[PDB]
Amino acid sequence: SGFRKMAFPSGKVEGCMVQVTCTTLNGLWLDDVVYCPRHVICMLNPNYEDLLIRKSNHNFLVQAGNVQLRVIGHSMQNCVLKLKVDTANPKTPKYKFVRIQPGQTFSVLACYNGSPSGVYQCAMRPNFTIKGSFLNGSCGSVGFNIDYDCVSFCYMHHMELPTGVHAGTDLEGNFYGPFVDRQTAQAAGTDTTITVNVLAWLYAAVINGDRWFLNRFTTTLNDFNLVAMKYNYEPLTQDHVDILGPLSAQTGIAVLDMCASLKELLQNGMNGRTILGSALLEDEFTPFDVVRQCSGVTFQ
Amino acid sequence: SGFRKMAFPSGKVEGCMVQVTCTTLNGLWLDDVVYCPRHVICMLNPNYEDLLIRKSNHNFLVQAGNVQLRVIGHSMQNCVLKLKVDTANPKTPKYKFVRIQPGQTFSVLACYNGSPSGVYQCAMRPNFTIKGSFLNGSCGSVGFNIDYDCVSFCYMHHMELPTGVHAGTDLEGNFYGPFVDRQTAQAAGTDTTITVNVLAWLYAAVINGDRWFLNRFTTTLNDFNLVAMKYNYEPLTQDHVDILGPLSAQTGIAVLDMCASLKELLQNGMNGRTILGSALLEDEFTPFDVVRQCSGVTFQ
Ligand SMILES: *[C@H](O)[C@H](C[C@@H]1CCNC1=O)NC(=O)[C@H](CC1CCCCC1)NC(=O)[C@@H](NC(=O)OCc1ccccc1)[C@@H](C)OC(C)(C)C
Numbered sequence A, B: 001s002g003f004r005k006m007a008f009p010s011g012k013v014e015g016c017m018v019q020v021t022c023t024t025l026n027g028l029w030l031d032d033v034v035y036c037p038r039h040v041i042c043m044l045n046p047n048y049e050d051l052l053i054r055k056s057n058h059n060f061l062v063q064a065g066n067v068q069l070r071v072i073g074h075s076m077q078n079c080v081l082k083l084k085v086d087t088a089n090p091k092t093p094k095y096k097f098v099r100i101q102p103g104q105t106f107s108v109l110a111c112y113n114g115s116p117s118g119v120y121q122c123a124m125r126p127n128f129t130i131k132g133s134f135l136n137g138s139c140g141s142v143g144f145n146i147d148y149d150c151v152s153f154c155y156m157h158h159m160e161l162p163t164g165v166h167a168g169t170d171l172e173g174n175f176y177g178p179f180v181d182r183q184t185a186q187a188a189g190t191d192t193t194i195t196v197n198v199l200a201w202l203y204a205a206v207i208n209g210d211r212w213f214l215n216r217f218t219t220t221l222n223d224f225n226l227v228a229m230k231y232n233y234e235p236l237t238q239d240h241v242d243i244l245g246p247l248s249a250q251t252g253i254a255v256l257d258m259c260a261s262l263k264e265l266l267q268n269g270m271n272g273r274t275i276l277g278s279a280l281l282e283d284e285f286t287p288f289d290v291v292r293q294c295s296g297v298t299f300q
């Protein structure tokens, strides 16, 4: 028992990280292609089209530890640069490129100089930013889930916005949110709490023996949303009630009974008490994350 | 910028994990030896001495993915079993065996069936437990730090105590705390807050722009301890003031001024406000952890 913010093991992604110099940042070496942010080639308003067809293959140096990989092509796709290289990565995992939704979680492998430095669990926020830990040289760090032996790549790091929050692309080079890879003043809007994830984490607490917040009440979905939206929580949808069904059956607690417990917690506060050792209601675990951590792991 | 509970990248430890069956749990394959909990051979009060010299090498099966490693010797050291095998692990990292102190942090790679399932950051608690996430079959999961290219192994998982907290050994098979590998009623005592780590994390907050808790006051070490010990914080020692020196110089905030800010926070509470997005003062980052995350990572 116990519940922790757990990342995926990072070894499959570590063997894909390389350095790209044109600026220095990180690239993802899969098959015979290295993917990295196009901004490696720049700043207030660049035209990447020009700067790209203007480079040769010898104007990108790609380092896989000490080994120079020879660039034999360069293409752009959206905000991602693809460098074709002479050698297929012998440590290419089975992988997919996925675009995630706000509320979904993933692991970040933060890299510098093509070298892994740390791993942590993030969520795509409703305002399409992530609250990461990234410094100068982290661009090209990736986000991923593992499903069986399969790495699902969902995020590539491009920029920090004011207020210490992070923006980036899917691996097809498409930004999450309405941000652009230019050094004009952008800002993420006000964020929202991920209601479904908070309920998932209240179920994890009950599975782990932490029951004090349960009450004898029930609520309707509309009465629940009437309270939650006052505290800047996303409205709970029928589809969110449905994906909580498995955690509901496992625990014997109806989703709308857990809603009633969460309603009381928002209106009365915690009274200095904690849940799974937190004084705030956590929103960075999905229903799937709870089930993986509480049972799914034993089948590894 | 940004500050997250960051684990070390786990790839170097993933290539050392194997399954051991005699009971099934995890082993650590370094050089020609597999290390795992001796309790793999059991329950209320076993004598391991007997059960050990009573097994042959064919009574331990060691699986490295699909590959059977042949056992050619078995020795016991404290609460750890060492299985000598015919083959040196070709993915043995540069490594040390270290015993950590209460207050120090490490990464856990939680494994099932010899296969990695997740990574998270833990601290050795003053009561010599860890607050982990471990289920049936997790024994033999390890804790580690990385220093340069060098894995420092500090923890092997053996048991869960009541209240959902975890106990284990160093890699010489020596328990952290006064626990034994027998199924007699044991309990960890009341725990303590790691004062030095809370100050380290208040420095991380200031580095990351979160300044609202700073005040104009100072305190002596004795007046600070007089308050902190009322809130079940460890007394701050001169040695703890010394190891905060670098974070002090970087930020221009004197350690005893940060003590005065922490004093006010303990007596007045946060007023529902947060620091680095937490409503509790966090104690699971050391001074070193702060410096690694805020700058040290760029030199990877
Ligand atoms: C990749 O290594 C880095 C990662 C950054 C470094 C600091 N923290 C990170 O996550 N990426 C950058 O440094 C990028 C690079 C530019 C991106 C587009 C064009 C090519 C260069 N820059 C930033 O991330 C800046 N963000 C930004 O410019 O946002 C728009 C903006 C401009 C002016 C006012 C407000 C907003 C960062 C470095 O700037 C701030 C810290 C001021 C947000």
Ligand SMILES: *[C@H](O)[C@H](C[C@@H]1CCNC1=O)NC(=O)[C@H](CC1CCCCC1)NC(=O)[C@@H](NC(=O)OCc1ccccc1)[C@@H](C)OC(C)(C)C
Residues within 6 Å of the ligand: A001, B025, B039, B042, B043, B134, B135, B136, B137, B138, B139, B140, B158, B159, B160, B161, B162, B166, B180, B181, B182, B183, B184, B185, B186, B187
């Ligand atoms: C290794 O795979 C597992 C890991 C456990 C599984 C559940 N969570 C974990 O972290 N280890 C165990 O299952 C061990 C194995 C025994 C250890 C010593 C002798 C050989 C078998 N058992 C436990 O971890 C139990 N803890 C325990 O027995 O503590 C002493 C005790 C006894 C009676 C009352 C109070 C305390 C767990 C499974 O028991 C409790 C969950 C009741 C604490």
